[PDB]
Amino acid sequence: PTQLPYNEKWEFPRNNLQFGKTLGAGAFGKVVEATAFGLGKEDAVLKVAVKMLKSTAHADEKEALMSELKIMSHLGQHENIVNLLGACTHGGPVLVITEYCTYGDLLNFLRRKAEAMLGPSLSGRPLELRDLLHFSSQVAQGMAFLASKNCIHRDVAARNVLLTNGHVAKIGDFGLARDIMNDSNYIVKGNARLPVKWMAPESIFDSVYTVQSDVWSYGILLWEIFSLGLNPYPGILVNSKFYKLVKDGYQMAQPAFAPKNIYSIMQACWALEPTHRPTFQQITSFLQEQAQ
Ligand SMILES: COc1ncc(F)cc1CNc1ccc(Cc2c[nH]c3ncc(C)cc23)c(F)n1
């Protein structure tokens, strides 16, 4: 990624952004909503999400932001990913301008939505099964696009899916703008904080990441969707027993709102042999057909 070249076609004048509230923050980074004036070929004026370093960041974090910018440019645009809209690299700190997604991350959306649906009994518009299938197929479409570019995401999870206008799902990555240090979904495994409960066995044990390991993580995401935002392996501590169980083929039980169909997809994503797992295109075609 560092050898990749940054194309100035993305360059945008930083004085043409008016910043609003912070959308998310990590230790050394954050994403901030902004209005951009004159953005793009149509000179649009619109709300954007700007990723930038915090004052706590150092050179290593700057290099990672620039690398992310180079990767987003190289990837190309797709309806079901968080697209790059421009960047500010001259005359100040690096700014990465991405699409703003009004409904926020999918995980929180499902949890708040489930609470809203249960409110009448205990005190707009409820979710339907078809919505869950749409979210699932949209994310699989976006993952099929990344896989077609041989791009490995490595942190597929509902917290990294964003919902835009029309409640269209987009796979993104909060990255530096996530507080992983204080986030119980990231486990201290040796040197780094890793989303172990989402990770394929070969990534945990052999440090191997592929499109097929993303497929596994996508199956965990499917479980999050069709449980309306439960934590995976709920109540189970990540320890030696957990690692062994995963390696031996232990799998989560069927989620409450998953049709047998969809749970079977999950199981296929969790095949121990990575080549046996479905491809994102197979998942997409099946889920599109199911969402009709
Ligand atoms: C496949 O995606 C990628 N792959 C590799 C990469 F290196 C980067 C990406 C996508 N980069 C990115 C940037 C910012 C954000 C946060 C974000 C954007 N819009 C929002 N609207 C609302 C809220 C609450 C948050 C946001 C996000 F999710 N992803």
Author numbering: 566 to 688, 747 to 915
Text of the article:
Of note, loss of function mutations in the tyrosine kinase domain of the Csf1r are associated with the development of adult-onset leukoencephalopathy with axonal spheroids and pigmented glia, the onset of which is thought to derive from microglial phenotypic alterations. To that end, we designed, synthesized, and optimized a potent, specific, orally bioavailable, and brain-penetrant CSF1R inhibitor, PLX5622, to deplete microglia for > 6 months in 5xFAD mice.
Cell free kinase inhibitor profiling revealed that PLX5622 is highly specific for the CSF1R, showing > 20-fold selectivity over KIT and FLT3, the two most homologous receptors. Two key structural differences between PLX5622 and PLX3397 contribute to the improved selectivity based on crystallographic analysis. First, the 2-fluoro substitution on the middle pyridine ring of PLX5622 is designed to access the CSF1R-unique space next to Gly-795 (a gate-keeper to the interior allosteric pocket); both KIT and FLT3 have a bulkier cysteine at the equivalent position. Anchored on both ends by hydrogen bonds and hydrophobic packing, PLX5622 has the fluorine atom at a fixed position. As van der Waals repulsion increases in proportion to the 6th power of the distance between two atoms, a larger gate keeper residue (as seen in KIT and FLT3) will likely incur an energetic penalty for the steric hindrance.
